[PDB]
Design a protein around this ligand. Structure first.
Ligand SMILES: O=C(O)C[C@@H]1CN(c2ncnc3[nH]c4cc(F)ccc4c23)CCO1
Length: 167
């Protein structure tokens, strides 16, 4: 039994809700919140800019030190950093950004990072400003993630389309 509330159940292990991931994170304090990161951990907009703003820029400060030590992530890769005031940990996952021409097949590799964590609060990878089709992202998520994932979808309209079209 966990503390996530109001989710619709899509499969054995995937759940979905219309929620602001920042507000869901601050209420739930999940063990892991997933950030829709880029390889430079530059949290300027989208989910990343919102999560970072909610940490009063502490996420960005920590991220800049991570990059200075380790260099950029790979597209499809991830790193575990602090969750600050939002979660115990933040799993920064780099989905492909279609608006940069990155290979959408890397989306499956990106979701594989979720399998290293028993339970996660997450956005749909490569959706929003990363330019991929969110319906496709949900399909890859369901077909790749085996651990328990609670998906937050900010936009009520897209949420309804994702549910109504789910196979
Ligand atoms: O980057 C991707 O792969 C897909 C993303 C997913 N995004 C979100 N998902 C869930 N909760 C979210 N709260 C937000 C608050 C904001 F100010 C901006 C974006 C979000 C947001 C929307 C942008 O696209």
């Amino acid at each position: 039994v966990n503390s996530f509330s109001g989710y619709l159940k899509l499969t054995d292990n995937v759940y979905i809700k219309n929620a602001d991931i920042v507000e869901e994170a601050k209420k739930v304090k999940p063990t892991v919140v997933v950030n829709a990161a880029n390889v430079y951990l530059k949290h300027g907009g989208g989910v990343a800019g919102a999560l970072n703003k909610a940490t009063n820029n502490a996420m960005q400060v920590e991220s800049d030190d991570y990059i200075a030590t380790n260099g950029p992530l790979k597209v499809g890769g991830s790193c575990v950093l602090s969750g600050h005031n939002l979660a115990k940990h933040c799993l920064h996952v780099v989905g492909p950004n279609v608006n940069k021409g990155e290979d959408i097949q890397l989306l499956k590799s990106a979701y594989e990072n979720f399998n290293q964590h028993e339970v996660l609060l997450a956005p749909l990878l490569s959706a929003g400003i990363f330019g991929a089709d969110p319906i496709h992202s949900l399909r890859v998520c369901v077909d790749t993630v085996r651990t328990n994932v609670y998906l937050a979808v900010f936009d009520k309209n897209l949420y309804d389309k994702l549910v109504s079209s789910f196979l």
